[PDB]
Symmetry: C2
Subunit: 688 residues, 2 copies
């Protein structure tokens, strides 16, 4: 119903600097800082109160929806050391210490990459702080020795001055780091004095330098939460992109266009010639957010250039980090290859290079269980990434994608890896499922009835007097092609018109093939168009377009012409007439653009038709590859012409062309045994 | 040009109580009244000044555009007696007296009915007042004895108490009357104390009774003229009707609709259940103004009832005066018979009785020179009244009437008879000629070019492959029928559409007759409609109506049906489509009215078609009279349905039906030898 939509809208108008689950680990360090003015106790007890409030039934601390030793142990350690250092509420320390001691051994049995960032860097400092309290603690553990060895390895791996000159990710986790400067390192924080926007690093920093820039930041965050802090703040750009991405993939973006373009122009104003980070001011930038923003901004008529990607290339390779070549995960390259589809022909080839590198890197590991990310856990990655690597941009239909994603969006059941298991709900909410699924279900139920309506219409016209193989399957497929490009209820007019004239042209093409052609013509077929229920105004235009199509049928005879582009042009003209829209006065650029679009469509149709023709003759595949490249070029070109926010022509008028061409390419790029499958899944196979 | 139109409009918004030429005769009597407060001189010298200003080159007084002894003599008499009674400016009396004396004899040679009202009644009192001055005056004249004898005759003809009880016209001219009461006669003046709204009677009355009601009236009129008074005042209703009558007959009423309906509702508010007079308050009412107002009010959607005419009927006769049966003139009965056309069937038969009585009274005297009125002189009455008695309401076309009237409207060259030769210019102006003629001329020049346009179109279509006798004359007549019902430039769309589909239907009817009928059908004629240049929206509706007409052609075969009403219904539908108008939601009354109109049209067409059919077979004329009555009844009925100001349907939508039916009746009620005549006169024969 609507209430979900309205709540989501109002919550979406209220985009703050961030919405993430409040962490406890960092709060514990916040408690460790005393009162500034030589006070008697800690700086802020609100954190303390928050801590006492949320003692687990097993005394632990952390998200209950999951169970992770490496994180529970650190949360418990930080809490117990904080409260007992300040020597208060010792009973809770006792309550948790039993679980601590009895769980001390489970750590040796963890997963491969489920290893928190600097996890082996804080834990040493953790037990160090502990040995001042020095309770009963089995410090004796080979796991401790292993992480110690890795500590020494990475310590021998890191420089001193490059570390003191070049701002790197290590500044995110510097508290477990020692043996440092405070002036050469002083300037390597963010615009707000935060080091990598992480509160723990800055808190430990202020512990050794009273720069008010850190105090004001922390005070603001603790004064905006009143007990509790996250592990990273803020995440404006991150959530901004990641919400609109869902709302596009969830097929509900039809309603929130205003707020959508609001966050869009925000990102645009904050766009850099160098890349993007989770926040506006973080100097170090990564590739994944950059690519995602690139894709989304292009997809809405914003002029950007992709040579910014020339920073994440590594001399014939690509690595998500700028300066670090570590084995990347699936998601960054996934979004990269995705954004690598909408290439405009006037752009540098870095996009193509990244595309081929990415597809190579992905297709191999696809067959195995390599879909495990190092920094997030979702419901089902493999299916999504597989379909993506399967159905290119030119063969993508919106409804089938949203249907597939309806079982691949996890909602709340996800977690995000950081220094602690955190989760965001602003865009990982679950009411999104209710809204989208209700919408899709009613949409299905509407398509179901209009289907039978069209069925009885088609039977009334006795069109099978010159039918095909069987009218049922083909009429189903035809109406499906229309329904898949337009799902809004208020356009069933254009929907049914499309389907009807499609069936018509099919019938007459069949009849013409069966008799040989227009030399064997006998009947007045320019009246056959009347079989469509006509309005008062929509009559004459259609008959004119129909006679035009017939004249084309005449002229295309005796030659080696194809007969497809004619049909596509007829289709777009008719869809427009049914949409009841005109063009304006027609300054020369306007009709120039129009004719350009039409010529592109006709050419593409002829080309891929001939390709299919050769495909059926067992032709040598190299020819198929040649023709595929050929259609690809003008495909890209047409897309660029449709996606220009500077166009003088209307928008819907543009996307119509896309609808038709995508329909044709799709139906020309799959066996029916998949088409019917998709058909039943989207129509008859019901949700909820 | 426009300036004439704007001046006429602004002058028309300024309708005063009256606009008539200022008389001098009555002013002379006004001068005769002394100062009220025992003053030293006359009451108002402004009249005197006015008099001295306008001494004629022959010393006389009166309109110079005409020369009438009976009036010049009285004006001169009144002036000389006034000025010399007050013994001032005697030289002017001498200057005029020579012409007076030398003209004293011409009076014996006047016209039959060119005899002013009470002319023989004031002249005796005139010479009576003179014999006090008693200058050289040949009182000896047999003409004086004749008018004296008639004085005595009428004095023996008039009663005393009926004259003292019943307000009659004699109260208009009572100054030459003596031997009277002043109380029984006191109440027989108008609402304003004026006796018959004439200033002379009231002035002589105040001379013998100082009723302020007369003083204020006269003061107002002399204070609103500052020297000079008319012979009758005011004339609000008179001019109100007589201006809009012209503006309707002059074919320019298209522009002044606001002010038109303003004066209309004025007359309506002042409408009585008893009749009308020249002014609002005159108790005695006459028939001519009543009938004229009746006609004009009905012609604009105002509900009135005609039993008010039962007052002017004289036991099987009609006489313009209520109570006096004197030999009437042409004009009153003329307007009466005119108003007697738009009879609604639900009305009493007094209209029909008056119609037959009037036509009988008129047709006889038509052949002679009986078109002389007793109270006005115009340019050419006979032609106008003849055409009126020739072309009934059902056979009246607006353009031919306005063209004929363009040579029958005299403009300023007219005079109006009263106690003195007076003239009004508010509605007898001459700039009306400039405006109307310029309009008509440009209209002609537009029709001339669109004619050649349609000619070349008709030739382009090769329609003569199944032509008629000769395309030229018939296509001319067809386009003429359209142009004669619509002359506004902005409707050439509907004009040309009408003409084109008329030619079409003619062609196909011819082809069908020539082959025998739809059994011998061979070609797809429901495509023949495409030969008309179609717009984007106006296409489908026309093809639908065309196929409807064809289906009618099919069904009407093998029967004794006619094939005309179908054509008329097709015509109105097509004219409407070209006009680009719809009906509203269609509450039941709406479509009820619609269907009613359509059924009426079809029936009338069939009936008069069959009548013409019998007419060509030398059928017995009584059958023709029977069928004529038959069409007449439903003709009246249809007219009543069109002329209801209470209709829920639009106006133009209504008058369209009238246009078509009037076209059909007209073309069915005249030899072509008159049609072509009218055609050349209206199109090629140019004005100015």
């Amino acid at each position: 119903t609507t209430t979900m939509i309205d709540g989501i809208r109002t919550a979406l108008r209220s985009i703050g600097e961030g919405e993430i689950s409040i962490s406890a680990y960092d709060t514990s360090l916040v408690a460790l800082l005393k009162r500034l003015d030589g006070g008697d106790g800690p700086q802020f007890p609100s954190t303390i109160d928050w801590i006492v409030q949320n003692q687990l039934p097993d005394g632990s601390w952390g998200d209950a929806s999951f169970f992770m030793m490496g994180d529970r142990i650190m949360s418990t350690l930080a809490c117990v050391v904080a409260l007992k250092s300040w020597n208060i509420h010792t009973d809770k320390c006792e309550r948790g210490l039993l679980f601590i001691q009895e769980n001390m051994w489970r750590l040796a049995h963890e997963e491969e990459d489920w290893m928190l960032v600097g996890f082996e860097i804080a834990l040493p400092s953790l037990l160090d702080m502990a040995k001042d309290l020095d309770l009963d603690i089995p410090y004796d553990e080979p796991a401790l020795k292993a992480i110690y060895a890795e500590r020494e390895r990475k310590l021998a791996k890191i420089p001193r001055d490059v570390l003191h000159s070049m701002p790197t990710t290590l500044l995110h986790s510097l508290e477990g780091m020692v043996d440092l400067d405070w002036e050469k390192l002083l300037k390597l924080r963010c615009l707000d004095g935060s080091f990598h926007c992480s509160p723990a690093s800055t808190a430990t920093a202020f512990q050794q330098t009273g720069d008010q820039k850190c105090f004001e930041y922390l005070d603001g965050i603790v004064k905006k939460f009143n007990g509790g802090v996250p592990c990273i703040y803020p995440l404006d750009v991150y959530e901004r992109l990641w919400a609109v991405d869902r709302l596009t993939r969830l097929g509900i973006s039809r309603h929130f266009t205003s707020e959508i373009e609001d966050c869009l122009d925000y990102i645009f104003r904050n766009w850099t010639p160098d890349g993007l980070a989770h926040t506006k001011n973080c100097p170090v930038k990564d590739i994944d957010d950059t690519a995602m923003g690139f894709r989304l901004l292009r997809l809405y008529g914003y002029q950007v250039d992709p040579c910014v990607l020339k920073k994440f290339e590594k001399d014939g390779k690509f690595f998500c980090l700028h300066g670090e070549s570590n084995p990347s995960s699936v998601t960054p390259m996934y979004n990269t290859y995705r954004a690598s589809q909408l290439k405009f022909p006037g752009d540098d080839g870095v996009l193509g290079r990244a595309e081929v590198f990415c597809r190579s890197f992905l297709q191999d590991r696809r067959g195995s269980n390599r879909m495990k990310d190092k920094w997030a856990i979702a419901k089902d990655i493999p299916g999504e990434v597989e379909y993506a690597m399967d159905y290119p941009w030119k063969a993508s239909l919106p409804r089938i994608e949203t249907r597939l994603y309806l079982d691949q969006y996890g909602g709340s059941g996800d977690v995000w890896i950081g220094k602690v298991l955190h989760r965001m709900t602003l865009f990982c909410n679950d009411l999104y499922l209710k809204a989208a699924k209700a919408d899709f279900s009613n949409f299905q139920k509407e398509c179901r009835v209009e289907l039978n309506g069209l069925r009885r219409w088609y039977l009334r016209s006795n069109l099978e007097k010159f039918g095909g193989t069987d009218p049922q399957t083909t009429l189903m497929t035809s109406y499906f092609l229309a329904s898949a490009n337009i799902f809004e209820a208020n356009r069933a007019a254009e929907r049914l018109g499309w389907a009807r004239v499609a069936l018509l042209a099919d019938a007459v093409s069949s009849h013409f093939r069966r008799i040989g052609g227009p030399k064997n013509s006998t009947s007045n077929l320019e009246e056959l168009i009347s079989l469509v229920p006509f309005d008062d105004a929509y009559s004459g235009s259609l008959r004119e377009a129909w006679k035009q199509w017939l004249m084309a049928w005449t002229a295309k005879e005796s030659s080696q012409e194809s007969i497809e582009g004619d049909t596509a042009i007829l289709l777009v003209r008719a869809i427009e007439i049914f949409g009841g829209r005109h063009v304006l006065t027609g300054q020369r650029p306007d009709l120039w653009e129009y004719s350009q679009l039409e010529q592109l469509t006709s050419s593409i149709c002829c080309k891929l038709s001939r390709r299919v023709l050769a495909q059926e003759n067992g032709e040598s595949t190299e020819k198929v590859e040649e023709i595929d490249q050929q259609v690809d070029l003008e495909m890209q070109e047409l897309t660029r012409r449709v996606l220009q926010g500077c166009s003088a022509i209307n928008r819907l008028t543009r996307e119509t062309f896309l609808h038709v061409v995508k329909s044709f390419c799709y139906v020309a790029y799959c066996s029916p045994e998949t088409i019917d499958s998709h058909i039943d899944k989207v129509i008859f196979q019901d949700v909820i």
